[PDB]
Write a protein that binds this DNA or RNA. Structure first.
Lengths: 714, 714
DNA sequence: GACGTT
DNA sequence: GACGTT
């Protein structure tokens, strides 16, 4: 093991993260020190760097020293920490390209090699920058220095950057200076910049001289300099009235601009000239402003025709929600628009008029309308749009499947579904109706127009499933989530019909998780098409106490590949039950039951079983027969049990075993005799009271597989 | 330790339960064996009893051998077990009074001492009884023998009891013979019986000769002999039509009868003569019959005037729910009635007419109306009743506090509360509105008529709490449960006003548990009256990351005694936070957070703290200073952490410490040096990998306090 | 110094 | 025999 206590990985990277080290490990001389190209020392306890820490690292290109010595405000305990660096610490490494010194209490910029390409000094204690700090860094392309004077990392004044301090850096393209209490753009920046992030300072005034000779700018973030603290979740200083102040020419010379962020700048309107001169503008973030009235009447969206993404979120009135909301005619052009975000504006009624302008935009794929407090939604409207893939109407008060037409209505106040809500939505493939108030008796009459519907999420509701023909109007339905509808199912003395599963010809995924199903339920679940059933969070235990009434509950699911029986209060698991389970099963999850014993031999009953998960049960040991012969098991999880010992040879027969999780048990050793091993690719043996005086050799033979604390003896 | 492996307790009882013993521990000769009056050997592995097992137990009066050798059907694994008993096993104990042999595969009744007063042979393998089996048991007062021939413990035939087999038992008062596949009452029973339980057999016919000369009967259970399997949750054989058959004189000679159970006897009506002759009848269970039409028209409730409890539940029609439901006029008399249970009949409308008959009954305290599928409920009706203490309308579709007027509406489909629902309910003191669909903006206008309301449970709803005057119409409200309303609180970018707490002058208990409160919330909670706040299941962690905005969140709760911050994702807990917490605190719960460190000294900041709960966190050890001086802590729970060691003297200063829970950690010893001990009353050191070769002496000195497995070495 | 997966 | 808090 060449680099203890650190870990050798591919791409010449050495991981020393989270080892609570007090200094940089020099490593023994015999190591291949020239081979290391990357060294990560994240979140250690290193408060002092030395000339000799990285000197022998001959091909070091990436170095990460993040979170070693956080300033008092960023320290979880608020411990002050001052990181000292010897003069030639990094000069000693003339190959160094990527240096991250963020979340470290250093007070000035150290001497750096001229090879450095990227430097992060974010959340450090550096309050001053001059030209001398960046002498001869001709390769430096990225400079991060966010968060050096703000509420979480305070300074009595602000970050000071002298005029032309970075002007000598001719290769610099990326510059971030957020949360530094600035009151103006630092003067004379390198014209090479393409990204400039000055957000969350207090640059409350702006002219073209502030962005002077920065003609290569591609992205410009200036938001949060003039904030609306009514919407703030963190410390916030309100923007004075009669601010902010810009003037038309500010951005006119930025012809290469593609992204402009003006969020949280207390804007009641925009000024055309700002944009007239930005012909390349793709993404515009106007969120958290006061543009509620502006967007109803504005004509500025004409000749913003190259715009692709537009964020208008939280442009809400302080005290009210609007009755209606009509978008200006100018939104119709906007022919390049792909994503429109209008969440958090607050309007109660969504109609045909509301989104009239947007109806003909040929590329509009995403419309975000959540958190608007909408009571009434005319959903047929969405059938009119040519390119719509995602409509989010979640968190309102209305009353695979990435990359197909999806409508998210979750977190609304729907009580009954009527089929007339889905007029014009025959194209819809995925519908989320999660977290509603739906108490309807679903009887095959709710979703009739939704003929393309492939996914229906109805979790977190009160659906009463007594009719045998529930969801029968969706024979093309592939996935149905009926978890967290426990209120109907937990009714005592009331029956529950699950026969409808048999009536859904193309259903592949079903969830009945967390329903508390425990008695008076259908005796058999039948389906030829179902591949995965989540039956977690039920009381299969109590069902299997009721004689043999429920012995063949899953048997009728003929082609079932995955079954989840986690959290079913199972104190025991007979060969009986396993034998009457579909023989097609490749994955069986049994997490967090109450199993103190497990007949391993009876696994033979499931010849196809590749994945078994017994985590969180109460196994005291691995014994009572080994893993049986012929077993196809590639993944086994027995973590968080009380496993105190393992019978010799216990795993051996698992010829396929790839991943084994033994963590959080009561093991005092790890013996090879348990396996026959080399094959094994993941061996998790963490959180075990390991005694430390058989494994030291064995564990180091198979170190590539092992991703490991002693409990003994001090 | 006189009785290892068993445990000596008060009342001369020796606990040997759940020790997986293979035989009865004889104990060393030196023990005070004459002092033991009771021996419990529940759920051990004892399949063989011997003459010498209890011979030295000179004053044994109670013996429990339950669950030692369960029959195949009752065995969790379905292991057959046959329990052998030597002839004089119990004869060897002439003082024996109470013998429980239930859940043991014995095939005949053993020889028993004449001192025996109570005997249980339930769920054993005894299929025959004769007079010889009970020779000379003149004291025998109680005989249990339920469940010896039924689905969970099958026999090919039935239990056979010869005529007059128990007739020699002149002191016998209690007899249970349920689930034994009987087809008639066993003939000539002792006239001394006062309780006779024959339920769940198949006694489908009944005449007075079956209860011949049993004039001292006080309680008679004959239900489930003639069942309706449509409502059954377990194996069930339907009752043939033209059955059951009784005739008027069956019960006429039972003048001392107080309780009659006729549940699940497929009754479409009752026959007067059955009851005409039972002047003492207090409790009548008619549940699971077909009495839906009978109770609308019957006149039998006249001259059932001494009846106190009446169960009519699940008297429902197979395929339907009734539109209305009018109770017969005869219910009005019935002047002795205290409890009426009418759940599971299924009717959609509850009106003034429905319960008209009951309106004037002077003692009616409990009316159970849950699980009826009621859509419309005229709640003012209940204001008319003179003695009503509990009305349960839970699990319907409507659209301290034991011993005061309570209305449970939980598990209905209420979306908005209107004050006009509570007209006439000014007397109501407790209201459960849990698990509804309530999405209302509570603004001080919902509960106006409820002037006596002391308890309001509004958990599991979607209450939006934005108005500062929510619940302001209840200034007398003492307890408010607002847990599991996370949908409003988890809305991102939306504020949440908790100022209303300050506006409730007499509020003592508040629950905000499991709301996901994490940001944009009131900065301070103020209240002079609040004594306990449950703030579990929130994100106080994220709130306390947002600078010092939330440093004084609980401070304004001036007289707060109990605070629950369990499950708040707390990775750390500064002296800061503790210091800005009410100084009145006696209980602080922090279960199941992510705390890997704890500054114990900073407990000094809470001088009144008697109870601290740190269970389920991630403490690796008890160190970093001991419990600080002056600490008033009487209960400390650090179970289910990863505590590997304890600094010496760690507890010492906790002069008051009464209860300490150390279970489920990584301890290898238990040292006295941790304490200074004698005071300590509960010391839980279970589920710890204890090494076993300092504690053996110490733990036995303080054995009275300790209620303990080795993990080492085999 | 310590703390902690930010 | 074993299993498990029924």
């Amino acid at each position: 093991p060449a680099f203890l206590p650190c870990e050798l990985q591919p791409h010449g990277q050495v991981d020393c993260n989270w080892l609570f080290l007090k200094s940089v490990p020099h490593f023994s001389a015999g190591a291949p020190r020239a081979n290391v190209t990357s060294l990560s020392l994240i979140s250690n306890r290193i408060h002092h760097l030395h000339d000799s820490d990285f000197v022998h690292l001959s091909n070091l290109r990436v170095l990460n020293l993040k979170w070693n010595c956080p300033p008092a405000g960023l320290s979880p305990m608020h411990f002050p920490c001052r990181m000292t660096i010897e003069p030639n610490t990094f000069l000693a490494v003339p190959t160094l390209e990527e240096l991250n010194l963020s979340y470290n209490g250093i007070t000035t910029v150290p001497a750096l090699p001229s090879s450095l390409v990227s430097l992060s000094l974010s959340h450090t204690s550096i309050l001053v920058l001059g030209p001398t700090h960046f002498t001869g860094l001709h390769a430096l392309r990225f400079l991060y220095m966010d968060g050096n004077c703000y509420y979480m990392n305070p300074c009595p004044r602000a970050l000071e950057v002298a005029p032309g301090a970075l002007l000598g850096l001719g290769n610099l393209t990326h510059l971030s200076l957020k949360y530094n209490n600035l009151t103006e753009v630092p003067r004379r920046l390198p014209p090479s910049l393409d990204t400039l992030l000055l957000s969350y300072n207090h640059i409350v005034t702006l002219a073209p001289e502030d962005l002077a000779n920065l003609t290569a700018l591609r992205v410009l973030d200036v938001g949060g300099n003039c904030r609306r603290c009514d919407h703030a979740r963190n410390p916030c200083r309100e923007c004075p009235k009669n601010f902010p102040k810009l003037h038309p020419d500010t951005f006119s010379h930025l012809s290469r601009l593609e992204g402009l962020v003006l969020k949280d700048s207390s804007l009641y309107k925009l000024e055309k000239d700002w944009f007239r001169g930005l012909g390349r503008l793709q993404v515009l973030d106007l969120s958290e402003n006061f543009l509620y009235d502006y967007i109803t009447k504005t004509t500025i969206f004409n000749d913003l025709t190259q715009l692709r993404r537009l964020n208008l979120s939280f442009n809400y009135h302080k005290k009210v929600s609007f009755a209606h909301l009509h978008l200006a005619s100018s939104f119709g052009s906007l022919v390049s628009l792909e994503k429109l975000d209008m969440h958090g504006i607050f309007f109660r009624s969504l109609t045909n008029i509301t989104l009239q302008s947007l109806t003909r935009l040929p590329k509009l794929q995403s419309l975000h309308l959540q958190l608007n407090f909408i009571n009434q939604a005319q959903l047929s409207i969405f059938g009119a749009f040519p390119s719509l893939l995602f409509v989010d109407l979640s968190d309102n008060r209305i009353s695979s499947c990435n990359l197909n037409f999806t409508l998210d209505l979750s977190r609304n106040n729907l009580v009954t579904i009527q089929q007339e809500m889905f007029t014009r939505l025959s194209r819809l493939q995925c519908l989320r109706l999660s977290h509603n108030s739906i108490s309807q008796a679903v009887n095959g009459s709710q979703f009739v127009p939704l003929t393309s519907l492939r996914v229906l999420d109805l979790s977190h509701n009160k659906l009463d499933l007594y009719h045998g023909r529930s969801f029968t109007e969706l024979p093309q339905l592939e996935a149905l989530d009926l978890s967290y509808n426990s209120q109907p199912f937990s009714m005592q003395g009331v029956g529950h019909n699950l026969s409808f599963v048999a009536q859904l010809p193309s259903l592949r995924y079903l969830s009945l998780a967390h329903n508390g199903i425990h008695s008076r339920v259908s005796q058999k679940l039948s389906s030829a098409s179902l591949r995965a059933l989540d039956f977690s969070g039920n009381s299969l235990s109590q069902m299997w106490a009721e004689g043999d009434l429920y012995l063949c509950f899953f048997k009728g699911l003929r082609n079932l590949v995955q079954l989840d029986l986690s959290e079913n209060h199972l104190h025991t698991l007979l060969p009986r039950h396993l034998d009457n389970l579909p023989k097609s099963l490749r994955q069986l999850r049994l997490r967090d039951n109450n199993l103190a014993f497990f007949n391993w031999s009876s696994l033979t009953v499931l010849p196809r079983l590749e994945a078994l998960d017994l985590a969180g049960n109460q196994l005291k040991a691995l014994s009572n027969g080994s893993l049986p012969p012929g077993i196809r098991l590639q993944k086994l999880d027995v973590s968080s049990n009380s496993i105190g010992f393992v019978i010799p040879g216990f795993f051996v027969r698992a010829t396929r075993l790839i991943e084994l999780n033994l963590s959080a048990n009561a093991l005092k050793t790890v013996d090879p005799s348990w396996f026959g091993a080399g094959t094994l690719k993941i061996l998790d043996v963490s959180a075990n009271p390991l005694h430390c005086a058989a494994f030291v050799d064995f564990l180091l033979e198979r170190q590539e597989a092992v991703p490991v604390t002693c409990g003994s003896p001090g």
